[PDB]
Ligand binder design. Structure first.
Ligand SMILES: [Mg+2]
Ligand code: NA
Ligand code: NA
Lengths: 210, 211
């Protein structure tokens, strides 16, 4: 038995003065997650490009918790559909960062990707990155994963650029609102919103304000 | 460069002066044919350097100009730097080659409009409001020529001044121009009349464009 005492007002409310209905409760999903003792505790995916975007490096920083061991390995593989595009495997132990050494509980993988299909609102090209925590001879501990979009966002010469091209934001602010369920969001409503926005030539959304 | 008394009069009465080198090669094709030519650098250098040597002590002169309507050549870049090196006390401006070249401290277009773009190839005349904020652009904009007062004209003059006042980096301009270049001729009875291009048997000519 779980018991949850939810308070309507808190010191937190001073930072939650958005122009919206003031409601309360357990209004998003509750879940139970099982992880092994030795586990992926964090991972960051970055994508860097050459000048013409004909080459990319996918860089993946992975962190573990649990007992450090020489036999531990991380494999990051990148998939385009059912096709494996790139893969890297390394033991734990980051580069030296200061006078006391590096992160023994971290590893950075670097995958080369030739002519990556680029992500934009116009063509949302996605790859699948799988992060496998495993033993040297390939016994899996656990896998995490995310969708990867190869795109570069930068400000140069006073212009916001996506993949080297100046954006024109056709944006709208969107609160999480349903007239019957209040501030509880469901997939069907989210999808309905996305289709309508795209059907009406929007390419961008601001998470107003959370 | 003007008659020397002009600068003395501007010093005393109080007018800001743009002193301009006697260099205009408008009729060349393309406009920079001579001013990109190192063979013409000596001749151009003297027109700039001798003006500076003559007029550099006048307080009314606040800006140097490299000339007018001669495209943009490497000769302009050399003479721009020569002025910056010998007289750091005055900005240098030059409109040729698109009004925002590396030979000018001031975006100084001629007849750029307030709101309307005129995107000519190579040498566009951006709307002056737009021009200021083009990517990477930081300089002040002062029109070297605007509001062409030919005949019944100066329509929309107020639109310029509204923008000048609203935008800090729009710091005005110089109307084209002060005085009709009409010449006097006489009829059979000795009555004077105002003449313009072509009235002296001069041909080819550009008729009333001198006024
Ligand atoms: Mg508010
Ligand atoms: Na102004
Ligand atoms: Na004229």
């Amino acid at each position: 038995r779980l018991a949850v005492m939810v308070l309507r007002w808190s010191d937190g409310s001073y930072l939650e003065d958005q122009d919206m209905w003031r409601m309360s409760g357990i209004f998003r999903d509750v879940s139970l997650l099982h992880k092994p003792t030795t586990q992926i505790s964090d991972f960051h995916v970055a994508t860097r490009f050459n000048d013409d975007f004909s080459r990319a490096v996918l860089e993946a920083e992975v962190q573990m918790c649990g007992e450090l061991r020489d036999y531990l390995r991380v494999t990051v593989s990148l998939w385009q559909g059912e096709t494996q595009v790139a893969s890297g495997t390394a033991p734990f132990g980051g580069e030296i960062i200061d006078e006391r050494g590096g992160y023994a509980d971290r590893v950075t993988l670097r995958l080369n990707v030739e002519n990556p299909k680029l992500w934009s609102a116009e063509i949302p090209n996605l790859y699948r990155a799988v992060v496998e925590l495993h033993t040297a001879d390939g016994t899996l501990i656990e896998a995490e994963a995310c969708d990867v979009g190869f795109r570069e966002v930068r400000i140069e010469n006073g212009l916001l650029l996506l993949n080297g091209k100046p954006l024109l934001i056709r944006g709208v602010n969107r609160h999480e609102h349903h007239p019957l369920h209040g501030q509880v969001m469901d997939e069907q409503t989210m999808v309905q919103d996305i289709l309508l926005m795209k059907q009406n030539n929007f390419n961008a959304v601001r998470c107003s304000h959370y | 460069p003007n008659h020397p008394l002009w600068y003395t009069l501007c010093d005393r009465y109080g007018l800001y002066v743009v002193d301009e080198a006697n260099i205009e090669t408008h009729g060349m094709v393309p406009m920079n044919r001579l001013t990109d030519d190192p063979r013409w650098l000596p001749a151009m250098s003297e027109r700039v350097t001798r003006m500076v040597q003559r007029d550099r002590n006048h307080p009314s002169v606040i800006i140097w100009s490299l000339g007018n309507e001669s495209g943009h050549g490497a000769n302009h870049d050399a003479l721009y730097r020569w002025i910056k090196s010998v007289d750091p006390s005055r900005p240098v401006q030059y409109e040729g080659g698109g009004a925002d070249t590396t030979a000018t401290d001031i975006i100084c277009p001629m007849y750029a409009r307030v709101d309307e773009d005129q995107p000519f190839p190579a040498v566009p005349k951006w709307s002056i409001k737009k021009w200021l904020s083009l990517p990477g652009e930081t300089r002040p904009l002062i029109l070297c020529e605007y509001a062409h007062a030919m005949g019944n004209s100066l329509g929309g003059f107020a639109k310029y001044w509204q923008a000048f006042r609203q935008y800090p980096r729009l710091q005005g301009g110089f109307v084209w121009d002060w005085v009709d270049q009409s010449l006097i001729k006489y009829d059979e009875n000795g009555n004077p009349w105002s003449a313009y291009g072509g009235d002296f048997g001069d041909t080819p000519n550009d008729r009333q464009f001198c006024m």
